[PDB]
Amino acid sequence: AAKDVKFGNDARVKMLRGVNVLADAVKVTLGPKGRNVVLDKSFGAPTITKDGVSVAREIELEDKFENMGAQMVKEVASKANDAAGDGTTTATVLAQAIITEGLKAVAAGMNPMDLKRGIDKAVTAAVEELKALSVPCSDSKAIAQVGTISANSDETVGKLIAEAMDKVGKEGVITVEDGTGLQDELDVVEGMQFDRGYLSPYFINKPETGAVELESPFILLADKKISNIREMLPVLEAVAKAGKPLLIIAEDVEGEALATLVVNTMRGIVKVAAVKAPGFGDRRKAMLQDIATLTGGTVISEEIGMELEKATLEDLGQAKRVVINKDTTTIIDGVGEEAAIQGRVAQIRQQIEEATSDYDREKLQERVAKLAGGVAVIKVGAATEVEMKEKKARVEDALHATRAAVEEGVVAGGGVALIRVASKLADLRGQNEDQNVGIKVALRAMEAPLRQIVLNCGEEPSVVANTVKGGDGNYGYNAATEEYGNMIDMGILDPTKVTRSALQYAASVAGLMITTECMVTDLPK
Amino acid sequence: AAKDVKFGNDARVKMLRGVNVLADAVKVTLGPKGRNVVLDKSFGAPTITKDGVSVAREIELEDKFENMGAQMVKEVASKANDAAGDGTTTATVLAQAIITEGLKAVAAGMNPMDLKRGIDKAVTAAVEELKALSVPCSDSKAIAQVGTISANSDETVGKLIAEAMDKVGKEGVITVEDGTGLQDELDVVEGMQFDRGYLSPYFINKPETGAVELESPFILLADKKISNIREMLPVLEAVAKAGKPLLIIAEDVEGEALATLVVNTMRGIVKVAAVKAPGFGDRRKAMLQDIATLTGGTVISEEIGMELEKATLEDLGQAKRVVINKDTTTIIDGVGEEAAIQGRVAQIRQQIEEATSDYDREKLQERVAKLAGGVAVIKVGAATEVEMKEKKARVEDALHATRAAVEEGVVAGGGVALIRVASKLADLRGQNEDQNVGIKVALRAMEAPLRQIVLNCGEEPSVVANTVKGGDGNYGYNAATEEYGNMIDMGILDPTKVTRSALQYAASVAGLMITTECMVTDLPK
Amino acid sequence: AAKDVKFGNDARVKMLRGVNVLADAVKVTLGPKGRNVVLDKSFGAPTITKDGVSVAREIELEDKFENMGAQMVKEVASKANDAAGDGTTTATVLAQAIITEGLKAVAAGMNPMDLKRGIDKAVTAAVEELKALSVPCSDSKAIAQVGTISANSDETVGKLIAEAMDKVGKEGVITVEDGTGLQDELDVVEGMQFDRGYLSPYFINKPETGAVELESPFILLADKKISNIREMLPVLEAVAKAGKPLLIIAEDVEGEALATLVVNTMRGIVKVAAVKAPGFGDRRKAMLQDIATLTGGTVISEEIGMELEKATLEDLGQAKRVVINKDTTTIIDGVGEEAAIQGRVAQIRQQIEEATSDYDREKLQERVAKLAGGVAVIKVGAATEVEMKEKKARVEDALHATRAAVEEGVVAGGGVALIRVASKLADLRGQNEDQNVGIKVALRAMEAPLRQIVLNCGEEPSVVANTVKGGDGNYGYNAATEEYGNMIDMGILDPTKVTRSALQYAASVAGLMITTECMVTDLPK
Numbered sequence A, B, C: 001a002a003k004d005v006k007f008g009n010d011a012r013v014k015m016l017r018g019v020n021v022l023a024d025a026v027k028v029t030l031g032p033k034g035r036n037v038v039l040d041k042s043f044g045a046p047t048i049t050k051d052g053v054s055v056a057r058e059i060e061l062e063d064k065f066e067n068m069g070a071q072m073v074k075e076v077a078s079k080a081n082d083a084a085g086d087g088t089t090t091a092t093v094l095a096q097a098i099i100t101e102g103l104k105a106v107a108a109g110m111n112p113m114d115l116k117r118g119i120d121k122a123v124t125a126a127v128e129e130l131k132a133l134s135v136p137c138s139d140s141k142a143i144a145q146v147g148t149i150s151a152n153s154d155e156t157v158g159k160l161i162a163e164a165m166d167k168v169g170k171e172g173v174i175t176v177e178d179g180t181g182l183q184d185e186l187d188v189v190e191g192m193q194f195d196r197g198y199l200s201p202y203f204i205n206k207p208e209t210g211a212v213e214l215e216s217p218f219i220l221l222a223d224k225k226i227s228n229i230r231e232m233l234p235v236l237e238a239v240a241k242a243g244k245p246l247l248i249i250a251e252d253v254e255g256e257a258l259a260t261l262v263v264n265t266m267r268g269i270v271k272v273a274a275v276k277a278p279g280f281g282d283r284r285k286a287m288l289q290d291i292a293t294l295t296g297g298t299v300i301s302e303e304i305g306m307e308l309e310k311a312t313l314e315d316l317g318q319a320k321r322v323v324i325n326k327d328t329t330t331i332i333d334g335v336g337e338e339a340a341i342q343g344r345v346a347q348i349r350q351q352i353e354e355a356t357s358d359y360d361r362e363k364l365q366e367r368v369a370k371l372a373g374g375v376a377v378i379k380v381g382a383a384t385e386v387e388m389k390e391k392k393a394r395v396e397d398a399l400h401a402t403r404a405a406v407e408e409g410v411v412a413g414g415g416v417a418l419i420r421v422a423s424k425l426a427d428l429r430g431q432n433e434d435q436n437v438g439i440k441v442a443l444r445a446m447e448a449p450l451r452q453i454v455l456n457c458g459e460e461p462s463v464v465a466n467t468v469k470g471g472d473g474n475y476g477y478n479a480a481t482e483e484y485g486n487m488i489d490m491g492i493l494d495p496t497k498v499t500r501s502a503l504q505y506a507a508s509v510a511g512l513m514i515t516t517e518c519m520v521t522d523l524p525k
């Protein structure tokens, strides 16, 4: 259709309008005392919320240019959260401020690339300063403590995290599940976690966690591309009985087979999940055979001349639970017999011993760790169902943030480590006087998280940031209690990965936003 | 229906509005440091691009005549890229400059024909100057260097290309495929490349490459016109089993059979591709018999009285891989047995010895080249899949640019070769005061590529081109590094074919652009 | 429904508006250097053309009456082209000019019949002078020269055409077909050409030629009216096998059978062509029997009482090729055996010897000439198929123009012959001052073809016509090469039939609407 074409600043003004609408509706919730937003529903009582994510998801703009600006900020804030694990509203504040400063520098008629260079060098130096302020969180004590902070001072969650850390390793596979009574059960079973997510988005059945969860599902151990549903009618019909789900793990499942499987899923005939087989080429068949060994199934490949029409449930591997994430399929307690798994582990271990290549050594180490270390199974015990589910979700959140704490340490939260970075980087100067202003674009806009936190708390952002500036290291301000101090002591920590990803993605979107010289959109007809 | 009939410069101005919208949205991305253009998507995250082609694709104008000008200029820029292999945004800039100058010359009330003559003679002399400055790139070292430069300083791609042309000749068939692990495998198999593409656009299944690729496909060696589906149904039914594709290599497939095949394709019943038999008349059946020999098939001709109703899989030829381009079907590793290949090669070599006509002699040489020279197969190996695919794409791009470099040599890139040409053609005069203007219309577009490149780089284009002029030969200005020097020294090269085709098609669109005295289009109701 | 009734000059102004729009869009392309017309397309790059016919075709006007004027002026231009063989733009210019001044004179109030009389007498004297100026092209030398000139300096085409007239006679049936290699093959086979075209437009399978072409077709030799499909189903079922088309050469086919056959054609079940039997009454039966003997078929007539239900392929006649034009069906190499053809020729020859009526004997000579002279087959040989097709098209064009030259001689081309005629007819006086103005209206438009040719060539029409007038006989001006001289020397020839038909049809349409005093159209709701 006919396109509405814009160039440079006419794009930038409306994109920044989208930026500012999104961030203004979002940031009113930043911090422990965020303000209320009443997001309408088509019927009945609406929802009053104090979270930036919730308001952000309900922000849409009828104008396409403002919509593009809002979306490009929203997706990059999501990127910051994803590489971060937290700080979506913090990342939104960072993004809006840095983007606004960069664009307003641009609209003066001044070089976009020099602003991008200055902001980039500022954010690199800020990452360096945050890393210097980063105190590592690697031992089990700091793991549990950060698990409490991320779980809102919930100590039992930190204990479960550390116990899984000790059982399957901190890099090991950890899953938290439903319990039976009031007892929290953590145990290690023969499992795996290979980086292969759902092939089609319609296979997800649990919106609460956003992962594919199946109870006693058969897994399709097919080492070939799936091209005809006719290969699946016997298998699908066999799975249809007894009310048990099916997992598809294969080289690839083509379009019509995916469509038929998805149709069978919403229509309630057969519940089936499809993910790609881990690895590719030579490694894919080996890892699929490892999956078969851990799950007690048979790999179906055209190399052995095995056809999917002549595929029964025995060839399909079986597990107690299989968890499929966005890009990860975790098979928990595969019914593959223990001695079979251990014999496969030993065989690939002699493969390690015969591995004369460093890449072969590393891939075989990964394979043995995944096949033998198993998965950490956490069961949530509670009196009723709701508290069980909510504490499971809290365990998930604390695990996610503690993983970032392990990866990169923690810094004093509440934006005060960012105030440290602003205080420490007052000396940064760029290759151009245009680059210099780009540096202070990232610097002042990085004390903005604390400032919006305190503003939402109803207190004064400026005196808080200034008093933190008077302090040093991890000295800061407790916004919930409206009291200053070092928030290592008063338990306000943001993992260094969180803030680093937030600032880096704010810089990335700002730099992409600076050098935007043309715009195209559809006509609003 | 009712038509919008216009004339002359009233057409030309809407033409030029289309030209200028296209070029303004496109050229902001020209050069190594192109600026960001954010292309709207109807949903979610928009697309931020720094490539002129991507922006040109999303340029549409609601008015009929502006979209008319934009479409013909976009098409001619595509022409320049196709006869060029690169410089799509460069060709767009050149076309915009020459088109605008010629149209503004016409609207003054002065003859289109003499502008055509002057522009044509200027562009001929400019091609002459570019050829004179062109340094041949035909030895292996310059081939590798140019493939490296076009592959963005990637030597291994150029080395694979050089090995492929060492194995099958530089005129031989070079193909790149997926590998198993991380190794680059180069080998030669029994295959051919005949200039016959897909019969219908809906047979393409890989939008990334825009070619029809099938794994172990059966080919329909029918030396007859295809008119009734009743001849085709048994073949399609036989192909339906085992999930293998089908290729149709015949004289012609009529509308209804092709439509039925296309229906089968999107319905997913049978994946079938149809291509025309190479050659025509007497040579077509001989080349089809060669295809059968290399694919181990049987030619089905009405001359021998063979019908497609009685056509089984045995009569169909088989190859490991068959690649169908836009106008080229390349058979790779046809199962036609090697001794059969050598026997057919010996027979056609005897025909070479018995060839008494130069046309028949050259047809026999091209047939022996296709049959026995084989195809060069380059496998791209990588640790993962995404980098595997991007390395394959970079190999394709370096192949495309290196082929042009071999064909016509290379010139100092960055737009400085055209600056050389413009400086050397300051002496050119036309046969008229008007024809002098036509020359200056063509000549002044020469610095425009460099100038847009440097402007997009955020730097000044003017004394850049001026210092290029002060320099000699290949001296110029490095745009990405913001430095001066020599392209042959600092490695910014553009094939002579690229720039020659860009300039020639800019001239051609200018000539058609100038001399148009009437319009027809539908009413905008 | 309600009608919009209009009278006289208010009709003539809408006439002339359509006339002038059509011709102004058409004539910008007249001559060897016609200007471009970018016919804006619905999608993609628009169509750029330098032909008056092409611009004429897409000239449609939203108002009923302006489109009306465009419609009959386009009609008359096509009429002059068809009765001419060339000069669609010349006819358009002449029609527009004579219509314009005739309609203006009528709107001035001067008599319609006297304007018509003066214009008619001017144009008949113009035809007289053009005939006097026409130099005949009857010799094989002039035939070859005219074929070369009309084929744009191609002597090989002229030689092939001359050989065709030398082998089958210039009144014989000449058809050009596809070649096998590079050899131009001329041969004679057994066929007739009878002035009977396809019954329905939907049977045409070659839009490029606008004639129904069938390869080895069965022909239905039914000497009866076809009203019920129930007689036609068995014939269609028999023809459907082996993928061969059917020709219906019958007395009459009513609506139901024809519609069923047409539906069968677009549905792609059976390709069917229907042609009326040549002649009427008694002669139709004899000519159908001649066709049967030519194709080895059997006449199916109700007089013998044989029906189409029991009509098999044996009763159907067979020919190697049957060409069905708009009002002509040419059967080429009918499989009717040569001795049968010669026996029928001898029988019709003795009928000639027994003929006692001049009309009867003339029909007898027509029958013997068509049956025994056969059809001439010319094969176009070329290295590639596309150049083969364009050479075949140029052969057809040179054939038509040479036939026109043989029919009415040749005149000095470039539009100088009408200049000669206008110079010679300056003395022509009418029966009235109105008829003198009627004479002057046709006289002045004579130089308009040359003037438009030279204008589009970018040169000076006035000085060209002046130097033509200063010269004598065939002295003129080369518009493409920008040179004066004798047109016979520079090989610029137009058939006298072309210009005569153009001017005569221009006068016809002008005088027709000159005498128009009422007009009705439908309301534009």
Ligand SMILES: Nc1ncnc2c1ncn2[C@@H]1O[C@H](COP(=O)(O)OP(=O)(O)O)[C@@H](O)[C@H]1O
Pocket: A029, A030, A031, A032, A034, A051, A052, A053, A086, A087, A088, A089, A090, A091, A412, A413, A414, A415, A453, A477, A478, A479, A480, A481, A492, A493, A494
């Ligand atoms: N009591 C507190 N004092 C100071 N800062 C706090 C306090 N509680 C939370 N914060 C800070 O506020 C931020 C939380 O903001 P929030 O509204 O949760 O946005 P998001 O959901 O995107 O993280 C964290 O980065 C944290 O450092």
Ligand SMILES: Nc1ncnc2c1ncn2[C@@H]1O[C@H](COP(=O)(O)OP(=O)(O)O)[C@@H](O)[C@H]1O
Pocket: B029, B030, B031, B032, B034, B051, B052, B053, B086, B087, B088, B089, B090, B091, B413, B414, B415, B453, B477, B478, B479, B480, B481, B492, B493, B494
């Ligand atoms: N470092 C550099 N210095 C000077 N010129 C460069 C440099 N890098 C690329 N170029 C020039 O920029 C052009 C690339 O422009 P590009 O954006 O790719 O347009 P297109 O896609 O139409 O080729 C090339 O012709 C090359 O000569």
Ligand SMILES: Nc1ncnc2c1ncn2[C@@H]1O[C@H](COP(=O)(O)OP(=O)(O)O)[C@@H](O)[C@H]1O
Pocket: C029, C030, C031, C032, C034, C051, C052, C053, C086, C087, C088, C089, C090, C091, C413, C414, C415, C453, C477, C478, C479, C480, C481, C492, C493, C494
């Ligand atoms: N070199 C030339 N010099 C003068 N007249 C020419 C030359 N070439 C072609 N012509 C004239 O131009 C006319 C061609 O017009 P054309 O565009 O074919 O109109 P149409 O399609 O209606 O015949 C011919 O009648 C011929 O007399």
Ligand SMILES: [K+]
Pocket: A029, A030, A031, A032, A033, A034, A050, A051, A052
């Ligand atoms: K909050």
Ligand SMILES: [K+]
Pocket: B029, B030, B031, B032, B033, B034, B050, B051, B052
């Ligand atoms: K670029």
Ligand SMILES: [K+]
Pocket: C029, C030, C031, C032, C033, C034, C050, C051, C052
């Ligand atoms: K023309």
Ligand SMILES: [Mg+2]
Pocket: A086, A087, A088
């Ligand atoms: Mg948070």
Ligand SMILES: [Mg+2]
Pocket: B086, B087, B088
């Ligand atoms: Mg390029």
Ligand SMILES: [Mg+2]
Pocket: C086, C087, C088
């Ligand atoms: Mg003509």
